[PDB]
Design a protein around this ligand. Structure first.
Ligand code: DTP
Ligand code: DTP
Ligand code: DTP
Ligand code: DTP
Ligand code: MG
Ligand code: MG
Lengths: 647, 191, 106
């Protein structure tokens, strides 16, 4: 017989036959007909004679189910094998994440639930047949698929003045204009973090200098008024008194009316200083609690320089007890005639920027004079030059050109983008030995995959339109080109076309290995094909733009949600191949693989033409004194490099 | 209509039935299903949360806090104390499902009007070099406000302080009120 | 130690204890001869005796409460964890739980 049973916790107890009996009884009591001891006795006696000296709970339940199957009453087992499993899941949720297998902070868990619920429904009921077939076999990737039912857009560039000038009202919240520096950065943060809930991407504030520039004068005037309230003087000509730069130096060593004019500047500089560190800390804490970006570096006034110096000092110091802040992402604009050469006005700020970037990895650098960023309306005397300066985002996105509007990056955004798998096509075609036929097949398949991707992007577009204005309280009332003309319940079909659609690529070196023995950064013949394929994609993009009445651009994906999602599913189907499916990366859009020893010069040489070719986004990342970054910036200027991020 | 609302709706709808059919005894489920008991905030059951809490703001103000990759340092002025209070409220909201409250707001924010009044006086010393050191702990009955007309000397160089630490507090209070009222799209708050 | 207080040994003490015979169980488990089944019935009986013993201790604890503080003069008024808060008529329910209960062998 059986004498000892080991409980699940670990205790050892004696064999009681009255517990294997009540369990089956409760299972039977919910199955229409409910029987009596006639079968209970048989099952219990059969179990308690064939067993060993000591048993476990799980083994006994295995025996119970095995006997309840080999009976005539099989409607009692199907209510056993279910209750037991529910209890297993319940007792396994005290230390694990069982609820996720079926489909840490509370908010993150709820968001995971929602994402997993939404994704398959879109994958089934919304896409079309050809698109679905393409997606299933690992040919393309639709970025941010879980927000599809919400007719959402990617990002925007805030016209921050339209909110500071007048008052903004969202829901029951209302806010008046600003009248000093402290109440300006706060409103900038409010508007920057209020629009995340209306979009599924990053946020940016261009012209960080000009928009806040008028707000370094107001505090100066107020301080003068307070310094002439008690003194009885009539310092009425100090209001619009031209200034050279808001520098601060010690006060002792003067007297009279020249003593009450250096103090005001000192207090004003301190006031402006505290606000910027508050801004940085706020944006840094919000993330852990929200991508963000700010652009500056091309203002030659006296207030703009003050703001730039204050922000640079605050970032160089750090946050908290000296830690490096992760946000906001800061980007420095370089132009030939403003801040580059020693004779230019803002050389000192450039040197300070290099000093800080040598340590805290910000700001990045954006060549404002590249051959594909220049604009033919930038006038150095206008007080509104910023309207003709390119601006970029932390996601490496570019929105400059337009076939039906002006050439600006203000109050514009991106609407979607999808990446295309290219290594798989080369591996698939690898079969035939003749070289020419492999290239012919590659070009034959690339066209079809491109057509499918374009159709998917257009269908996304057609769905995104038809969204009422009220669904986006802030974006479609103050921060989009056509706002101020849209009624609360009108569709946004008349202003949506001022946007962009991207087609991204990933892993070109592997694609080259599958058609030649060397990648782009090892053999001269290799690059002649990479250039050709990128050129093919750009030409087809132009054709699609003409056909569908939209804007299309090529893209180097940021590699944030799609890093290994492609290589794993490719090793399984086709198995290991040397140097193609053996690393668990797939390299980025068009860089040189990180595992190949190469210098800065050669990498830049091989990469610049691609920068020219990819209008929708590009990068040039190099991993390592303030003089080091000078070499990087000079390298960017020498060639047509657009956006560098050395750090 | 906003994307966040739709995502939250999906989450709650996907979480309720699992709670009903996995993490409840038979009697509880029957009582729930027959309109006998209602469990407040059942969509948050797998997120083992708590509802309301009364904030000890002293620990947040005196020292700082290190959550995630963020950081902060002690507050040495009213305008940088109110903001920390708001930040604590909004950051603790995401880890619960109820409201947030601050008891004895007055006591918690009392010890910073005085620091402001000290910095304001120190600002006057660098202009009219004097001592003005009998005021750092001078006893003030009330920071009442009156016009600065009909005074002279050191008796007017002190009223000015009472007249400039009465407006920073005004701005900070109104900024707090506005900030906690714009959470419509940026939370339940009590003071 | 403690599970509802701080680590101290002042104004604290025992409440009661009981001792559990061990050898009788080994003697009873002597007919067995497998050398591995014999050692298991021992644990089988030990678990049950421990269960009943804990139940007895809890019952004695339940009876010990309901004792008015006026029948322990110089203990529930000056010498205990926190008796400066009780009254002659109040029972000592709110404070008794700072003591420890014991199980011994031989
Ligand atoms: N004394 C026992 N003798 C034999 N088998 C037992 C005994 N106790 C439990 N089992 C085994 C067989 C029963 O089919 C199965 C279910 O027992 P059950 O009493 O529901 O669980 P349990 O003993 O782990 O504790 P609980 O009281 O929490 O349910 O466990
Ligand atoms: N409502 C029911 N429907 C069907 N079978 C049931 C039901 N209740 C109990 N049973 C059967 C199957 C269970 O394996 C067996 C033991 O039930 P029970 O003691 O509630 O579970 P358990 O001991 O495995 O769970 P727990 O994790 O709560 O200890 O009885
Ligand atoms: N954190 C905040 N979030 C939202 N609104 C805020 C916040 N802080 C202040 N506000 C409000 C206060 C005002 O309504 C507006 C900013 O106005 P501001 O230029 O600072 O002064 P004001 O107009 O209130 O001053 P005055 O009292 O002289 O009229 O924004
Ligand atoms: N809006 C904000 N968001 C987040 N943290 C903030 C915000 N405003 C202030 N802080 C935090 C950052 C500072 O570390 C902390 C204390 O600020 P503050 O009183 O200016 O101290 P401090 O170290 O700058 O003092 P001081 O320069 O006057 O000696 O408050
Ligand atoms: Mg400070
Ligand atoms: Mg105001």
């Amino acid at each position: 017989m059986i004498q000892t049973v080991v409980k699940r916790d670990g205790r050892i107890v004696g064999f009681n036959e009255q517990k294997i009996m009540a369990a089956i009884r409760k299972a039977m009591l919910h199955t229409d007909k409910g029987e009596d001891t006639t079968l209970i006795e048989q099952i219990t006696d059969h179990i308690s004679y064939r067993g060993k000296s000591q048993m476990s709970v799980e083994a006994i339940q295995d025996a119970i189910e095995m006997e309840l199957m080999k009976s005539a009453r099989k409607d009692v087992a199907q209510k056993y094998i279910a209750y037991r499993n529910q209890r297993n899941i319940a007792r396994k949720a005290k230390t694990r994440d069982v609820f996720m297998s079926i489909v840490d902070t509370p908010a993150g868990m709820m968001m995971k639930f929602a994402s997993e619920t939404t994704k398959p429904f879109v994958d089934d009921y919304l896409l079309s047949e050809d698109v679905r077939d393409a997606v299933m076999h690992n040919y393309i990737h639709i970025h941010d698929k879980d927000y599809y039912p919400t007719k959402s857009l990617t990002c925007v560039q805030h016209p921050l003045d339209v909110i500071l000038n007048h008052g903004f009202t969202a829901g029951h919240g209302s806010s008046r204009p600003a009248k000093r520096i402290e109440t300006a950065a706060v409103l900038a943060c409010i508007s920057l973090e209020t629009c995340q809930n209306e979009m599924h991407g990053g946020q940016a504030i261009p012209a960080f200098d000009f928009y806040l520039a008028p707000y370094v004068r107001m505090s100066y005037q107020e301080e003068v008024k307070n310094l002439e309230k008690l003194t009885g003087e009539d310092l009425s000509n100090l209001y619009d008194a031209p200034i050279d730069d808001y520098i601060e130096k010690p006060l002792d060593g003067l007297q009279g009316r020249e003593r009450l004019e250096q103090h005001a500047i000192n207090k004003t500089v301190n006031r402006v200083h505290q606000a910027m560190e508050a801004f940085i800390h706020n944006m840094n804490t919000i993330h852990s609690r929200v991508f963000s970006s700010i652009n500056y570096g091309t203002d030659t006034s006296a207030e703009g320089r003050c703001i730039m110096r204050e922000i640079l000092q605050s970032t160089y110091q750090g946050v908290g007890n000296g830690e490096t802040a992760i946000f906001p992402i800061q980007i420095w604009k370089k132009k030939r005639g403003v801040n580059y050469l020693p004779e230019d006005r803002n050389y000192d700020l450039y040197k300070l920027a290099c000093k800080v970037t040598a340590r805290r990895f910000f700001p990045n650098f954006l060549n404002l004079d590249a051959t594909f960023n220049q604009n033919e309306k930038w006038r150095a005397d206008d007080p509104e030059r910023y309207k003709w300066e390119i601006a970029t985002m932390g996601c490496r996105t570019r929105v400059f050109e337009d076939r039906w509007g002006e050439k600006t990056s203000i109050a514009r955004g991106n609407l979607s983008f999808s990446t295309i798998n290219i290594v798989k096509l080369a591996i698939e075609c690898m079969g035939i030995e003749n070289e020419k036929q492999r290239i012919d097949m590659f070009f034959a398949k690339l066209d079809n995959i491109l057509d499918i991707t374009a159709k998917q992007l257009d269908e996304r577009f057609q769905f995104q339109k038809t969204a009422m204005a009220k669904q986006f309280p802030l974006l479609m009332k103050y921060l989009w080109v056509g706002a101020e003309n849209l009624k609360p319940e009108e569709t946004i079909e008349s202003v949506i076309n001022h946007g962009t659609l991207g087609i991204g690529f990933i892993g070109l070196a592997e694609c080259l290995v599958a058609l030649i023995g060397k990648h782009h950064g090892e053999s001269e013949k290799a690059q002649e094909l990479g250039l050709k394929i990128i050129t093919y994609m750009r030409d087809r993009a132009n054709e699609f733009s003409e056909q569908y009445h939209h804007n299309y651009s090529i893209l180097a994906t940021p590699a944030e949600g799609l890093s290994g999602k492609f290589t794993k599913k490719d090793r399984k189907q086709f198995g290991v191949i040397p140097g193609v499916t053996d690393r668990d990366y797939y390299t980025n859009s068009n860089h040189v693989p990180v595992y190949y020893k190469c210098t800065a010069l050669k990498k830049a040489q091989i990469e610049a033409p691609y920068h020219d070719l990819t209008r929708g986004g590009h990068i040039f990342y190099v991993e390592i004194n303030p003089s080091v970054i000078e070499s990087v910036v000079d390298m960017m200027d020498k060639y047509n490099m657009g956006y560098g991020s050395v750090n």
